[PDB]
Structure formats: structure tokens, C-alpha cells
Amino acid sequence: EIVMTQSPVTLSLSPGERATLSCRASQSVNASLAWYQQKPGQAPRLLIYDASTRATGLPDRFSGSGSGTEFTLSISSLEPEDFAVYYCQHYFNWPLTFGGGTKVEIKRTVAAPSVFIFPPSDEQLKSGTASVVCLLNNFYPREAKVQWKVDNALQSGNSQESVTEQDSKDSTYSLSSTLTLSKADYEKHKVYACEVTHQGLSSPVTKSFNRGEC
Amino acid sequence: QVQLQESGPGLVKPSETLSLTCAVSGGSISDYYYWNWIRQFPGKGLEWIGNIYGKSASTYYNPSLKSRVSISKDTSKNQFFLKLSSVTAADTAVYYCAREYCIGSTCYPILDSWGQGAVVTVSSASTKGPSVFPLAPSSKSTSGGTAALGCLVKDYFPEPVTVSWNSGALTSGVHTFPAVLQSSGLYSLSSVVTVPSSSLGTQTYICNVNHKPSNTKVDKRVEPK
Amino acid sequence: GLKRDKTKEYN
Ligand SMILES: *[C@@H]1O[C@H](CO[C@@H]2O[C@@H](C)[C@@H](O)[C@@H](O)[C@@H]2O)[C@@H](O[C@@H]2O[C@H](CO)[C@@H](O[C@@H]3O[C@H](CO)[C@@H](O)[C@H](O)[C@@H]3O)[C@H](O)[C@H]2NC(C)=O)[C@H](O)[C@H]1NC(C)=O
Numbered sequence: 452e453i454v455m456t457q458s459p460v461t462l463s464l465s466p467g468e469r470a471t472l473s474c475r476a477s478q479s480v481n482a483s484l485a486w487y488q489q490k491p492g493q494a495p496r497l498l499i500y501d502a503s504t505r506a507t508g509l510p511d512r513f514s515g516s517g518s519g520t521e522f523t524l525s526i527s528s529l530e531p532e533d534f535a536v537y538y539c540q541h542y543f544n545w546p547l548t549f550g551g552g553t554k555v556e557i558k559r560t561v562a563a564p565s566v567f568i569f570p571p572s573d574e575q576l577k578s579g580t581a582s583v584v585c586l587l588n589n590f591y592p593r594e595a596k597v598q599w600k601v602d603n604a605l606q607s608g609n610s611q612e613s614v615t616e617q618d619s620k621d622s623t624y625s626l627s628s629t630l631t632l633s634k635a636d637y638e639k640h641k642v643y644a645c646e647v648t649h650q651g652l653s654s655p656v657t658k659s660f661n662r663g664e665c
Numbered sequence: 666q667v668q669l670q671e672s673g674p675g676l677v678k679p680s681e682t683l684s685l686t687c688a689v690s691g692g693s694i695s696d697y698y699y700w701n702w703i704r705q706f707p708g709k710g711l712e713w714i715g716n717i718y719g720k721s722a723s724t725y726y727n728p729s730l731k732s733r734v735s736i737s738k739d740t741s742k743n744q745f746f747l748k749l750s751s752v753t754a755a756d757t758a759v760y761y762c763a764r765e766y767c768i769g770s771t772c773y774p775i776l777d778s779w780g781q782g783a784v785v786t787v788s789s790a791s792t793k794g795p796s797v798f799p800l801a802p803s804s805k806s807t808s809g810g811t812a813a814l815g816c817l818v819k820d821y822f823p824e825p826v827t828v829s830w831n832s833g834a835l836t837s838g839v840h841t842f843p844a845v846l847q848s849s850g851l852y853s854l855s856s857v858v859t860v861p862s863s864s865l866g867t868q869t870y871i872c873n874v875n876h877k878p879s880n881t882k883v884d885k886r887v888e889p890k
Numbered sequence: 891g892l893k894r895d896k897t898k899e900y901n
Pocket of ligand 1: 481482501502518
């Protein structure tokens with residue numbers, strides 16, 4: 452098969468800037484090259500084919516160029532909705548193959564997270580486990596430090612984090628951190644706290660609760 | 666407005682056969698198009714599996730799978746099918762059906778119209794439906810005039826779980842997190858929404874959770890403790 | 891490269 456390789460793996464650019472995505476074929480595919488955009492939770496969408504022909508209705512900011520083994524997709528002025536993974540695909544011979552994708556992230560101004568904490572529910576405690584959840588909402592950039600403390604003891608190794616994909620309108624992220632303890636351990640401590648450090652916070656923000664308190 | 670929809674099991678045991686159906690509406694399978702299967706691996710790579718012509722037995726397959734793949738069609742039902750035998754964990758992927766692109770009288774083997782994707786996991790583990798717990802709003806989850814609330818969907822297998830709020834009427838401010846794989850080998854996720862704190866006494870918030878592999882559907886009303 | 895008239899199969 453012909454192998455398609457894309458670079459860079461990821462791009463992070465401010466709105467209005469030009470994104471240049473490259474695709475290389477292991478042997479010439481002449482002009483038999485297409486580009487797709489895939490947004491979170493969706494199938495890929497065909498953008499360009501024959502290297503440079505736009506699908507009907509495509510915004511003009513998307514343009515394709517190249518020939519043979521070297522191709523480019525340009526986004527002439529990035530918009531927040533352009534957050535996606537972009538893939539190339541050849542159709543020169545069988546089998547059809549795709550590049551590995553370039554993820555395009557949108558820069559925006561720093562936005563500090565709002566922080567929220569949730570104790571375990573009584574329904575969950577009935578079953579011997581306690582999950583404590585800390586939510587960081589609508590922030591940028593993606594990097595954030597979340598530290599759990601239980602009666603002032605820093606926790607490590609008993610939490611897992613999840614982060615949303617970048618929002619298509621406001622270009623922010625949200626993040627959850629879930630601390631898992633046995634019910635027996637949970638009931639032996641009083642103060643549960645999540646401490647958040649982020650570029651948008653002048654100093655760290657702590658949200659806490661006392662077990663029992665409504 | 667051709668529309669494609671995949672269906673079939675979400676869990677297949679190793680060495681067994683993965684079967685999926687694509688139902689087409691807005692157009693006939695018996696048409697001058699090739700109908701395709703594509704898969705997307707957990708690492709986001711895309712792989713073309715094969716195709717079948719709407720008007721003949723003509724098929725093309727990726728040679729890396731040719732020994733264990735079959736694509737067929739049933740034009741009386743307006744469906745086409747994928748069968749992949751001798752599966753392993755390397756076949757865990759989202760499987761898409763798609764129709765190739767034609768413009769005027771010229772067609773190319775690139776994909777115009779796609780289904781929504783069928784998530785399929787190859788594993789020896791059994792399906793397990795989730796437990797759903799409230800992330801109840803309280804003063805601990807109120808910042809200024811905004812409150813956060815949610816649902817924790819814990820301990821299920823395989824993926825995916827979908828979550829909506831208020832039967833789809835509440836979409837603004839919702840964040841449904843990607844699942845995490847826990848030490849137990851079960852997945853967990855949460856879905857949250859932010860709303861005006863003043864709405865907690867004047868609006869009802871219900872999270873609608875669906876885990877199709879276990880036939881589990883839950884509606885949970887989340888209220889202050 | 892691969893292409894076809896709409897009423898024909900690929901080669
Ligand atoms: C690759 O495919 C092209 C056809 O595709 C077209 O050209 C690409 C370079 C891109 O611009 C694509 O977007 C576009 O669809 C083949 O091009 C054809 O090459 C032949 C041979 O050189 C040309 O024929 C010649 O034309 C001159 C007239 O200028 C005559 O004097 C000659 O006698 C001969 O007929 C033909 O014009 C050209 N077609 C086009 C549309 O440019 C190209 O050959 C192919 N590459 C390979 C390696 O096979």
C-alpha cells in the first residue's frame with residue numbers, strides 16, 4: 452500500500468492566523484488526494500478532493516494544493532469552529548489509506564477556571580466506595596494542576612482526570628478530577644479539598660467541604 | 666439527505682465474528698454508488714476496510730484484512746453488511762459506513778456521506794451496566810450566581826455511554842467528559858452542567874443516561890441535598 | 891488514479 456504521513460501532529464494557533472497542514476505520500480499519487488475534517492463526536496467531513504477542488508459550499512478559507520508526493524491544506528484565517536482533526540486520504544490505487552491526522556487547536560486569551568466540588572452521594576456510600584469530584588469549568592489553556600487534600604494530606608495515585616475537547620465556540624476546556632476512596636477511609640476524615648493552580652489564577656484556589664455538612 | 670446508520674453488537678469475544686449492519690434512508694442501496702466500511706481506532710487512526718457496488722457483486726477489500734472480511738448487501742431491506750472474522754483486541758474500533766462521492770457523472774473512492782459510527786470492543790469481559798449517582802448542587806458547587814450539578818456514571822463495560830439533559834432540551838453549558846478506565850477494568854464518566862443558582866428552586870434537571878450494550882437506560886433527577 | 895464514470899464499476 453501507499454502510506455500517507457501528516458505533519459505536524461498538532462497545531463495551536465490564534466484566530467485569524469494561517470494554518471498550514473502537510474501530507475506526504477510514500478509514492479506519487481499524482482492528484483488523487485482528498486482532505487477531511489473531523490470534529491469531536493462526528494464522522495469525518497470531506498473538504499477537498501483532486502488535491503485542490505473544494506466540496507460544494509465549503510468556506511473559501513480552506514484550500515488544498517500540491518501534487519505527486521507533497522500536499523498542503525491551508526486554513527487561511529482560523530476560526531474557533533475550525534477546531535478538529537484533519538486527515539488526508541489518497542485514492543491513487545487500492546487500498547485507500549489515510550494519514551494519521553493533524554489536530555488543530557485554537558489559541559485564545561487566558562481564562563481562569565471556575566471550581567466546584569461534589570461530595571460522594573449517600574446512594575454511592577451505601578455500596579462501600581466514595582467518589583469525590585472536583586470540576587474546573589471553561590478555562591484556557593488546557594494545562595492545570597489539581598491537588599487533592601484530605602485532612603491536609605496531599606493525595607497522589609488515587610485520582611483520575613478527564614478533559615473535554617476544546618469548545619467550538621469559546622475555545623475553552625473543562626476538566627474533572629475524581630478522587631476514589633473506600634467508604635471506610637472516607638468516613639475517617641473530615642476536610643476534603645481540591646486546590647487548583649492555573650495560568651489564569653493569580654494564586655491557587657481551594658474548594659473544600661467537611662464530611663457530613665449539608 | 667441520504668442518511669446511514671450502523672447497528673450491531675458493541676462487544677465481541679476474541680476469535681468470534683464481528684457483524685454490523687448499515688441501514689440507508691433517503692436513497693437506495695441499488696444505485697450507482699459504492700458503499701464502504703471504515704474504522705477508526707482508539708488512537709484516532711482511520712482505516713478503509715472495503716466496499717461493495719450497489720448494482721453488482723463488485724467488491725474491493727483492504728488486503729490487510731482480505732482473508733477475514735466480507736461485505737454484502739440486502740437490497741430488499743436497503744441495508745449492507747460487514748462481517749469480520751477471527752477478531753482480536755486489535756479490532757476494537759469505531760466502525761463507520763459511508764457512501765462514496767459522485768459529482769455529475771464522475772465518482773471517486775472518497776467518502777461523502779457517513780453514518781454515526783458503531784463502537785465495537787473485542788474482549789473476553791462481560792458487559793456491565795452503569796450505576797448512576799447524582800453530583801448534587803450545593804453551596805460547595807456554587808460560585809457567584811452560578812451552580813454546577815451533574816451525574817456520575819460509574820462502573821460500566823464496554824463503551825459507550827451517552828448522556829443528555831432534560832431529554833435534549835438542555836444543551837448549553839453541558840460538559841460530558843470522556844470516560845476513564847478504572848483500575849477495575851470498568852469505565853466511569855461524569856456529565857455536568859452549569860446553571861443560574863436561582864434556577865435550582867424553579868427548574869428540574871434530569872440526566873438521561875443510555876448504555877446500549879447492557880440495555881441500560883436511566884433518568885436521574887438531580888436536586889439539592 | 892482511481893475514478894469512474896457513474897454508471898461503470900472501477901477497473
Ligand atoms: C497526472 O495526472 C494529470 C492529469 O490531471 C491533471 O494534471 C495534474 C498535473 C493536476 O493539475 C490535476 O489537478 C489535473 O486534473 C496528467 O496530465 C496530463 O499529462 C499528459 C502528458 O503530458 C498531457 O498530454 C499532453 O498534452 C500536450 C498539450 O499541452 C500535448 O502536446 C501532448 O501530446 C499530450 O497530449 C495532458 O495535457 C495532461 N492533462 C492535464 C489535465 O494537465 C499527468 O500525465 C499525470 N501524471 C503522470 C505521471 O501520469
